[PDB]
Amino acid sequence: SPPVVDTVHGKVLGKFVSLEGFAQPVAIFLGIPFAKPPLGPLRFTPPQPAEPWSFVKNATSYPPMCTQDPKAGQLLSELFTNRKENIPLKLSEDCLYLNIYTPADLTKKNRLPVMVWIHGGGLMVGAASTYDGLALAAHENVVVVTIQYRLGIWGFFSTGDEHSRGNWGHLDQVAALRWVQDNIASFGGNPGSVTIFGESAGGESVSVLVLSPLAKNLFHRAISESGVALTSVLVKKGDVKPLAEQIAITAGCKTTTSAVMVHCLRQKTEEELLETTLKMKFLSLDLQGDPRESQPLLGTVIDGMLLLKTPEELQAERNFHTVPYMVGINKQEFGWLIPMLMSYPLSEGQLDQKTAMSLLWKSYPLVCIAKELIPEATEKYLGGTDDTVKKKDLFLDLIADVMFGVPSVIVARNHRDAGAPTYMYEFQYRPSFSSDMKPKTVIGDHGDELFSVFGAPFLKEGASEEEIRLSKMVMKFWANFARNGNPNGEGLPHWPEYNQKEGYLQIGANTQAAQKLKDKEVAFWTNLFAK
Amino acid sequence: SSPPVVDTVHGKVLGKFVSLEGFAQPVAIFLGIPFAKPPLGPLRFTPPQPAEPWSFVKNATSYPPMCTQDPKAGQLLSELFTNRKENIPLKLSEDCLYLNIYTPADLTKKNRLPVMVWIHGGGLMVGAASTYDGLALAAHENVVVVTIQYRLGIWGFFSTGDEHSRGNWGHLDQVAALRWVQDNIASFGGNPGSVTIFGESAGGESVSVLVLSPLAKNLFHRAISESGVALTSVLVKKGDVKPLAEQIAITAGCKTTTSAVMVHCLRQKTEEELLETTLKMKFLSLDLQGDPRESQPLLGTVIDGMLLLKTPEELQAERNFHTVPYMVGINKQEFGWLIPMLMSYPLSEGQLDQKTAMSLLWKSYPLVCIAKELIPEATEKYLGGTDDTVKKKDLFLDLIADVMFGVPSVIVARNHRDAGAPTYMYEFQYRPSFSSDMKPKTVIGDHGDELFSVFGAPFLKEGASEEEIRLSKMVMKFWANFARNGNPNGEGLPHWPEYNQKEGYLQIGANTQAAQKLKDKEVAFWTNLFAK
Amino acid sequence: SPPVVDTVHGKVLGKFVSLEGFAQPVAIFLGIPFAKPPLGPLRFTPPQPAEPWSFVKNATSYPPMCTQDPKAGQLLSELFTNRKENIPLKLSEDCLYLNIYTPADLTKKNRLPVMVWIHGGGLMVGAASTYDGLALAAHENVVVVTIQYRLGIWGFFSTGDEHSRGNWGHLDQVAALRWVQDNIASFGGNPGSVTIFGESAGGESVSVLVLSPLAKNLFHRAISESGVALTSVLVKKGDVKPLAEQIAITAGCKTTTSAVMVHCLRQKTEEELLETTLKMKFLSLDLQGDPRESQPLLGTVIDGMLLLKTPEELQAERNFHTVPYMVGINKQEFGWLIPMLMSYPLSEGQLDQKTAMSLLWKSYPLVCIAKELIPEATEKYLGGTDDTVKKKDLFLDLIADVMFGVPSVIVARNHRDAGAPTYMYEFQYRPSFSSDMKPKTVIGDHGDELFSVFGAPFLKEGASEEEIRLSKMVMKFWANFARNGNPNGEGLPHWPEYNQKEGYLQIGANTQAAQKLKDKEVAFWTNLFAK
Numbered sequence A, C: 001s002p003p004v005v006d007t008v009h010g011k012v013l014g015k016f017v018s019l020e021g022f023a024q025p026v027a028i029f030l031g032i033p034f035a036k037p038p039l040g041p042l043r044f045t046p047p048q049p050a051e052p053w054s055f056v057k058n059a060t061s062y063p064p065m066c067t068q069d070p071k072a073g074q075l076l077s078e079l080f081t082n083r084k085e086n087i088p089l090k091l092s093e094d095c096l097y098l099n100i101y102t103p104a105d106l107t108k109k110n111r112l113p114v115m116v117w118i119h120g121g122g123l124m125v126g127a128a129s130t131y132d133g134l135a136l137a138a139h140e141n142v143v144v145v146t147i148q149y150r151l152g153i154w155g156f157f158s159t160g161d162e163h164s165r166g167n168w169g170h171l172d173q174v175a176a177l178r179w180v181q182d183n184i185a186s187f188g189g190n191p192g193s194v195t196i197f198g199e200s201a202g203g204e205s206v207s208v209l210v211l212s213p214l215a216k217n218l219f220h221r222a223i224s225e226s227g228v229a230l231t232s233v234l235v236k237k238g239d240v241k242p243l244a245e246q247i248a249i250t251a252g253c254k255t256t257t258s259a260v261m262v263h264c265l266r267q268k269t270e271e272e273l274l275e276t277t278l279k280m281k282f283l284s285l286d287l288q289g290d291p292r293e294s295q296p297l298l299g300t301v302i303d304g305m306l307l308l309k310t311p312e313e314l315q316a317e318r319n320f321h322t323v324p325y326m327v328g329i330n331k332q333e334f335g336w337l338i339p340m341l342m343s344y345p346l347s348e349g350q351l352d353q354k355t356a357m358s359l360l361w362k363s364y365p366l367v368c369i370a371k372e373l374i375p376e377a378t379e380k381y382l383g384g385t386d387d388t389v390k391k392k393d394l395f396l397d398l399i400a401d402v403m404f405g406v407p408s409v410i411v412a413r414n415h416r417d418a419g420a421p422t423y424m425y426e427f428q429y430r431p432s433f434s435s436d437m438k439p440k441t442v443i444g445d446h447g448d449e450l451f452s453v454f455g456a457p458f459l460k461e462g463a464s465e466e467e468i469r470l471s472k473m474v475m476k477f478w479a480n481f482a483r484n485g486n487p488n489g490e491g492l493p494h495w496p497e498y499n500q501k502e503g504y505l506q507i508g509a510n511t512q513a514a515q516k517l518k519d520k521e522v523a524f525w526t527n528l529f530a531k
Numbered sequence B: 001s002s003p004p005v006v007d008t009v010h011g012k013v014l015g016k017f018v019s020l021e022g023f024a025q026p027v028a029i030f031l032g033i034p035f036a037k038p039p040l041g042p043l044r045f046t047p048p049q050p051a052e053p054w055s056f057v058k059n060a061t062s063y064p065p066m067c068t069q070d071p072k073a074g075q076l077l078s079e080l081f082t083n084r085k086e087n088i089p090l091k092l093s094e095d096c097l098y099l100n101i102y103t104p105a106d107l108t109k110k111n112r113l114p115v116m117v118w119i120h121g122g123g124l125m126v127g128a129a130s131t132y133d134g135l136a137l138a139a140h141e142n143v144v145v146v147t148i149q150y151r152l153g154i155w156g157f158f159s160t161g162d163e164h165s166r167g168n169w170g171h172l173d174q175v176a177a178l179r180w181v182q183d184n185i186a187s188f189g190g191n192p193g194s195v196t197i198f199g200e201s202a203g204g205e206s207v208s209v210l211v212l213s214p215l216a217k218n219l220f221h222r223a224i225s226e227s228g229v230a231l232t233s234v235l236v237k238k239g240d241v242k243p244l245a246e247q248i249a250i251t252a253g254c255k256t257t258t259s260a261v262m263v264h265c266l267r268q269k270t271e272e273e274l275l276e277t278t279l280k281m282k283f284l285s286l287d288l289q290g291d292p293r294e295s296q297p298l299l300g301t302v303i304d305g306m307l308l309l310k311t312p313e314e315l316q317a318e319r320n321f322h323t324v325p326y327m328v329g330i331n332k333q334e335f336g337w338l339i340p341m342l343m344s345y346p347l348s349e350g351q352l353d354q355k356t357a358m359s360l361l362w363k364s365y366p367l368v369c370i371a372k373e374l375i376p377e378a379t380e381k382y383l384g385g386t387d388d389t390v391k392k393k394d395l396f397l398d399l400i401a402d403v404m405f406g407v408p409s410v411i412v413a414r415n416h417r418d419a420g421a422p423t424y425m426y427e428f429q430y431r432p433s434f435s436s437d438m439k440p441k442t443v444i445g446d447h448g449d450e451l452f453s454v455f456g457a458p459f460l461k462e463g464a465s466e467e468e469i470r471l472s473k474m475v476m477k478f479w480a481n482f483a484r485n486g487n488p489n490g491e492g493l494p495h496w497p498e499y500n501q502k503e504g505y506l507q508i509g510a511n512t513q514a515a516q517k518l519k520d521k522e523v524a525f526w527t528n529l530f531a532k
């Protein structure tokens, strides 16, 4: 009969689902609430504990996904989902739910490691349900937990002061971790060993939680898949007031004072705010006006509660969580996904340095490279061959290095120097679950490490023997690290700790170790921005 | 040295004299004259009506609003097409049926110059008349240039497929405007016996429509369709339209009980509301999710029974159109950079392999209308010859272009020809200096690249070579001559062969010389493939 | 480098403004929150502590003024302002701020006397920003604090029971005094010597705080200028339910229960409420209807928290916590300003016994004189002369005595008989800063003392030496009082204590003691009022 777990707030009811090659069925709990629904007055304020219930809560229905662009959410979800068919989602502000996938034997009393996944999506789109944690849970025998946090205006609108500090979405993730620290045992998970991991916005968040005091003791290992707290685009530095006003005004609200804007914004309907989010055209590159005045998304800010100062200023202080940290990236972070999902101006694969300098400028909101520095940057990259077909491919590398590549290593380095176990990797593979509209040449595009990490090859039909092999290995590494803080294991290519040798593991069809990841680009960029 | 005041049928109007360099005869210009009663409230979704006459002197010295459309989407298109040194930022309004007039005629003496009436493009979803300044062309060719606006998007094209909201509103505004010119143009020095309508893309398809419309009879005399015709698969919606109307009704939060109900409901929605519905529909962008066949990129022309009595195909199939000089033309790379860029096309890698090729061609159903089974065969008839990754991408755009504009144009042209009416074709191949910076030097003859010549931008915008300047001068001369004799050929100009049985046309560009059989082989393959 | 102070709730960044003849520049702090913005839920409820902030609250721009009729607000700020230029302001419900002008050297420890100013405006309009405390703070070297409090419907609506007690404005004022107790120390001010002062409705408020247990230890010196707790127009005795019903009906609300009205009004927008204020056409003499019903102001009430009994009853009981109270009036309280701004039907400058009687009756809301007694009052005042000119002057004297004259003196005497130090004055002077439309014949009009108390001669242009002297003297008198409970000091004419001799100071061109101020008046009115 159905699994029933007794949590602090009440009894939850799930469902048993076994996986091929596994006698033990995983116990799936869909839609467990960890916070009071963030409605009306609770909008733009930290999350509050959830109220308890009297009987047995039926946790077997996919919770709604946090309000967001309905078409963006769906497209993105179809792309990264590791399921056979993408599960259609309903929008709601009442979306602080998390899903539990546990292989543990609920009759006895186990303590399996807990891996908490924070989806990516730009703090704008994304859903937890997009990722099914059956395969990973079954194969590596760990308790997977997919959590949701507030997105867009709802989760990151800030006035720069006490009237609306911001990072509501992040305080949610903290609340989520805190909920796991209190109830996970009930599901066979060991609260003493929680690993947080995510990609893109998820990775950036993981990185932010390593830096925040509100997160200490809530996790013991961290993995950052293609995204950190130095990916400038997601982190809002300097005065944010203008952006709050731009939104307030668009939502049709006065801007007399901070208290007034936030008060007028809580009055808007979910529908209303969505229409503003739509008018704002986030997650899309503006081709008119000054790129500096453009703002693709509402992200993390230095509220003074979660983050007490710029990540950069923090790392320098060596003041943060010195827990095992695994940072990684993919060979072509700007391969096709991001650009295709941001309406990037690129059709002809022919790209001249002139036209190249123009986009690099229009890309300001992504790369943030002062105009008078564009020529030196474009040169160091496209100055190679006179091949206009090779320049655009190199141009794409330029973006990737700035947005993800360089930031990652810098984080990796400082964490390293902070006296803690560090790990790095470079994912270079091309899954057959990639969209048809994706060129066969793009290998290691954004989010390609997801299918391996989440055992897509056991949930989807059609994988190759190679892919299947890759996934197992990747899931193996991730799990080991989840319990030891060291990915190394038997029958797995040795993964070098990231020390002064700067050794990482090149994960791909062929997975060997290497050294000096992006050594030159780091130096090159660290210099130019220091100009 | 006092301002030019002209008396129209509905009252006096007051413009301003402006002179272009090198021209002694100044140009009298009028901005925002109303050619119809503002289509507000009850007038939404209904034929345009005569403007209300005024008592004193109307100030026609300021630019008029552009019809409600995607603000960001319209301004963007206006910066990329404007022939002015600095783009004019415009305001949105349902009260948008105005027209700007530029006449080099000496208002004191009784003049009767040819009248060229423009019709802006923009997928019948965006665009404004104030973007195409008409000074240069008037001054340089002594022709009265009129630029007109017309209801766009929902406002100008919503249809329930029956009487309650036939459709074509915008096209009727266009007629209304032509009607206006007839009754008032003489006051501005024009000759209502020589009206040439011309437009680019949506503007061009509109011209080919009017040429096919009875309600346009006796309203224009020469016609020029620049890269867009009545057969451009994507602007003319054949089949049951009811589904679209309902999807739209439903988005604006309206019932679908009856056509009557939907229409009435929508009529009470505020301008803002419809604008939010337009955004939500996310028009003029390629839908990569769902079923490509259900995708609907833009509301367009429909067979209503008032403007169009049968399908464009049927009308030109019989001799049910007007035998007036018609100049049809296309650009070298219609699907070069502009359109794709502006529809969010996925091409980051800039190179495609057969597979991904047939794939995307499918998502492109609304733009090319090719069944899933035909996709493979067509993709090979284009991307097979070579096994080069980027050459396929290039050859892949040709595909779309030939289907969208190339083929249609020739067919529209051949028919007119076979109708006994004088026809003329051309192919613009040239990369203007005023091209978007984000545009690769590799794109030549992209969509609307010919607009900079036609309107003589090299005389308003700065930084142009002797080449460009000479090209604009040649184009304008060709157009104007056409608008004067219905024959572009004139003194000191390459010979432009008439598009008769030998299929001669003009390849315009740095090197401008005649050629024959334009897209003859493309016409064959497609005419063939769409025949199952 | 601008001055930065740490208050209990966070760092504030102000600005240094030097004044002529004085070294130590003044530290000016504008728009400091002393309470959580009374919005939504909080509308019509006690004022609340503000939320602490995280970095440095930059306070170098004037706060909004509590929603009120814009026109009335601005015209008044114009006439009462002591600044070279009148600063236009923004209306907002988010208005609970206060400005500070500290001449202390924040780098060293200081304990200078604190003078809290409560602006007048009939409790319907007014703003703290109107009064620049530069001159006073520097010349007398005291810390001037200008506070704001809710106005009109927002600050004084009540149903005469628990659902909306009323007196929200005064609670805001007491709230500001509490802030000053816990913060001014950080601004060189002594929280053990806080003096409150205000004129008109402000003087009445100070007069109310003086009588309320809620303020017991928030001030140690009080000063009422033209307005006291007995100025009947500003206090609502009896059943207030009819005015709350009228307001609700006009606001478009039902009148089913006290709880219902409150709730419905609490759901209307800021604008919908402002419009109600406008439709009620407050602060204007109601020429139509029964005088007795017209409500020109929405004022103080016997809520039960702030005021436990009527002002009159509270003066009887001789409480054990007392302070030095200064009470003063001007020579022509109802001279020009007030009736000019209330659209008084006194336009032919003349007046006969019959027309006076008619005018007095309509004045019921201001003088509260029964119809049966009008003749006695009217004859007792205009029966002296024979010409309609002097008769009119005497009519403006009747009103003035009923409104401030007698009430004031009754308040002073009771304070005296209670055992605390009392002082009075009658200001007689026509400041050069008067309004062009004010005829030169009016001397000691309402509010004319303001320019002397705030040193307009040191901020505004063209003051004669005599005016400049009068200001220096007034300020010193006010300061000596602020730090002694006695205004006397070296270089100043003598001010006698207001004891059984009823000695008071006559301030003006020529300043000197006198006795029995308004003595006979207080007599004629006390008796007649008991008929």
Ligand SMILES: C=CC[N@@+]1(C)CC[C@]23c4c5ccc(O)c4O[C@H]2C(=O)CC[C@@]3(O)[C@H]1C5
Pocket: A072, A076, A120, A121, A122, A123, A125, A200, A201, A204, A227, A231, A233, A234, A283, A284, A296, A297, A337, A338, A339, A341, A342, A365, A366
């Ligand atoms: C599914 C959405 C498309 N997709 C475009 C590309 C790359 C990335 C991104 C977006 C918008 C602006 C960016 O700068 C940016 O960088 C990435 C990131 O870190 C998280 C969010 C995001 O995954 C998302 C939108």
Ligand SMILES: C=CC[N@@+]1(C)CC[C@]23c4c5ccc(O)c4O[C@H]2C(=O)CC[C@@]3(O)[C@H]1C5
Pocket: B072, B073, B074, B076, B077, B121, B122, B123, B124, B125, B126, B200, B201, B202, B234, B283, B284, B285, B338, B339, B340, B342, B343, B447, B448
């Ligand atoms: C944001 C860009 C503007 N946006 C949408 C307007 C209408 C349309 C268009 C453009 C430029 C020139 C046109 O003639 C034209 O018609 C439309 C079409 O068919 C495809 C491309 C396009 O969707 C795009 C740019």
Ligand SMILES: C=CC[N@@+]1(C)CC[C@]23c4c5ccc(O)c4O[C@H]2C(=O)CC[C@@]3(O)[C@H]1C5
Pocket: C072, C076, C120, C121, C122, C123, C124, C199, C200, C201, C227, C231, C233, C234, C282, C283, C284, C297, C337, C338, C339, C341, C342, C446, C447
């Ligand atoms: C339109 C409002 C009427 N208007 C101007 C009359 C005179 C005065 C006043 C009021 C109410 C009660 C008074 O005692 C009183 O005196 C004046 C003052 O000092 C400030 C406020 C005020 O300007 C206001 C209301």
